[PDB]
Structures are given as structure tokens and as C-alpha cells.
Symmetry: C3
Subunit: 143 residues, 3 copies
């Protein structure tokens, strides 16, 4: 099996990540993840904090995962790309998930809290079975 573990680490993040076990019955490859707060993306590089700590596991072992833009991220009203193409998250990383987004236009772009600009893909592109939303301040499960 392949499972994700997402823990909100701020107040605004808790509103979008209440404790739950989410099943991927549609069997999509990506796990959508929220902005959790309104933000304005200036032209050029923007550092976006996702306000979550994430773990991925495959066959009982902690693995890495990848951050990929959703197709909806770039539109005619927002010329947005992920600076690093895809974000490579190593299994040893236990910090907060971050995004480097380049606004390629000359116009600042308003992003809303509920929007999901990116999705998480497990190492090896394995379909996630469950997305476990952990409680804030809890210790992550052992793998």
C-alpha cells in the first residue's frame, strides 16, 4: 500500500486539514494540497509556505514524494510555474513543505486560501490508498 500523512502546523492550515482518513477511490496519482491563506504572487520568484508537514510511506517504509503543479495552476489570468519544475522531497525531510513559484507576467496575481495549486505524488508514482490528515502537535506514525 501507499499512504500519505499530512499535518497542519498553523491555525489557518487546521481549518483546511481537520483530522480524517481520506480514501482515494478515484485512484488519482496526485494529492491536492491547499494554500490555506490568501496571498498575492508578485512578478518573479515567490516563496509560498504550505503550512504542513508531510510524510509518505510505501509497503510500510517511509518514502519520498514529488510536488507537481496542477494543470489549473497556470491560466491566462496567472502565468505561474514551479521554479524547480517538480519539487523533490526526500524521506529524511521533516520540515515544512515549501513552494517556489515564478509569476512570469508583469501583473501581481491574487491567490485564495482554498485553492490547490500543486499536488503531491508518491515516490515511484504509486497511487495513494489513504491520505491521513494528522492532528496538530502529534508525533508522526512509525514506519
Amino acid at each position: 500500500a501507499t499512504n500519505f500523512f499530512i499535518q497542519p502546523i498553523t491555525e489557518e492550515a487546521e481549518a483546511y486539514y481537520p483530522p480524517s482518513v481520506i480514501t482515494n477511490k478515484r485512484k488519482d496519482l496526485g494529492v491536492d494540497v491547499y494554500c490555506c491563506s490568501d496571498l498575492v504572487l508578485q512578478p518573479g520568484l515567490n516563496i509560498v509556505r504550505l503550512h504542513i508537514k508531510v510524510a509518505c510511506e510505501h509497503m510500510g517504509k517511509k518514502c519520498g514524494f514529488k510536488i507537481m503543479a496542477r494543470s489549473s495552476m497556470c491560466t491566462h489570468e496567472r502565468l505561474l510555474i514551479l521554479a524547480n519544475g517538480i519539487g523533490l522531497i526526500d524521506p529524511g525531510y521533516v520540515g515544512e513543505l515549501m513552494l517556489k513559484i515564478i509569476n512570469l507576467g508583469d501583473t501581481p496575481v491574487q491567490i485564495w486560501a482554498k485553492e490547490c495549486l500543486v499536488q503531491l505524488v508518491a515516490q515511484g508514482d504509486h497511487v495513494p490508498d489513504h491520505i491521513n490528515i494528522l492532528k496538530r502537535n502529534q508525533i508522526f506514525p512509525l514506519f
Copy 2:
């Protein structure tokens, strides 16, 4: 085994995709796909229809795949990138493939139908064994 299934939608796409079975003797990871139409990429974002329906399978079961730019897509004369970095195609997706291409230059760029700007990589990067080009008016296996 890992196999791709490509079905042309338009008459022009059928010209570039006649029914056949292509073998991946070189053992390449990506499956180059034609644009299947001449097109002009305006500066900024461009929505490009590939005029094909694609399914990927791994060990008898339908799987997802990924759309990746080819090295030749970007040159000194055309600054083209895929807007989403790589396209993530879920196994449940059954519609026509599409590309979001950003022309970073200030002048329109002409692309020919025979050009392969992008390649398809199976979920998990499994190397394809066969690329099945299907007839236009049939249903997927």
C-alpha cells in the same frame, strides 16, 4: 509488460497515426507524440490539443502516465516550456490529451504537425514494450 495505446481523433491525426504496432527496441523511456496539426504558439500561454486519446497499461491493468517535454522543444529560436512542468495523467482520464505550452518569447512561433514537442512516460517510468496505434472508430480494450 507496459504498453501504450494511441487513438487518433481527427483525420490529420490519423495520417500521422495509421494502425500499427510499434516496438520500443531502443528501450527508451518516453513515447514521442506528434502535434498532428500545424500550429502557431502566441507569446504567453497556449492551450494545445494533441488530437489523440491515450491509454497506458501495466501488467494488464490500466495505469497513469506523464507528459514530459523533449529536449528539442526549446531552442534558441523558440523559448517554449510546459506550463505544469510535467503533465500528470491519471488512469481514470479517458479524454483527449492536451498541452499547456508557454511561449516565453515576444514573437509567435510556428510548429509543424510532424514535430514531437513532448513524450509520454508510463507511471513509475516503466519502459514501454509496445505502442499500439489504434483505428479511429474503435473502442479501447
Copy 3:
């Protein structure tokens, strides 16, 4: 197991890649890789040679790998992206590894030889066990019977 093999080509690449076997105790997915030469990235597309020969193997067989930008490659001061998003390296490729880097800014950007702008990831995202830095005068492995 999954292992990478790196052989420097130029003199300065040899200075950055002396013979050694690097173990991936952190179990990181990416293998950081040096520029091996000072370079100036002009606005627009830049074709960059990595000055190394690279192979990846998985369960005794040669496999492909992927070139991914590191998070450190793009900063507020240098707007650098990989033109193809990620570089897909087929196992047959054996030639020298190339980069297509777009400088999105209006002024040239200086990169130092010691900087690691990109990282290599094995086919299927398998975590590498060892990273073998080969001498310039030793045989590069083929991982297969000599074909045809």
C-alpha cells in the same frame, strides 16, 4: 540495488570528481552534481555541458534517470529554470550529460564551478545505494553483453 556511476571528462571535472565511492546514508532521492566549470548564463536559453559521463543501474541492469533542478537553482536574484522541466535520460544515451537552462531575467547570471544546480534521480525514483566516482582511465561499465 540502485547505483549511479559518474566519470569526469575534463580536467576541472576531475578536480571535482576524484575517485571514490559515496554512500547514500541519508537515503536522498537526488544525486547532486557539480557544474565543474564557471559559466555565464545569458538571458534566454543556455546549452550547458555537465562535463561528466553518467550511468544508472537497477538490479544489475542499466536504467534511465532524470535530471531535476535543485530548489537552490532559482533565487530572487537569478531566475533560472530547466527548459524541459525535467531531463529524461534514456539508458542508451551514453554520451555527455547536457542541460538546457533558461535565464528568465534581463541580466547575465554568474555560476561557480562548485555549485550544484541540478540533481539526478533514478528511473522509478529508486533511492541510490552507492554513487561511484570513476577514474578517467578506468573502464565505464556497460551492464550488458556487448550488443550485436
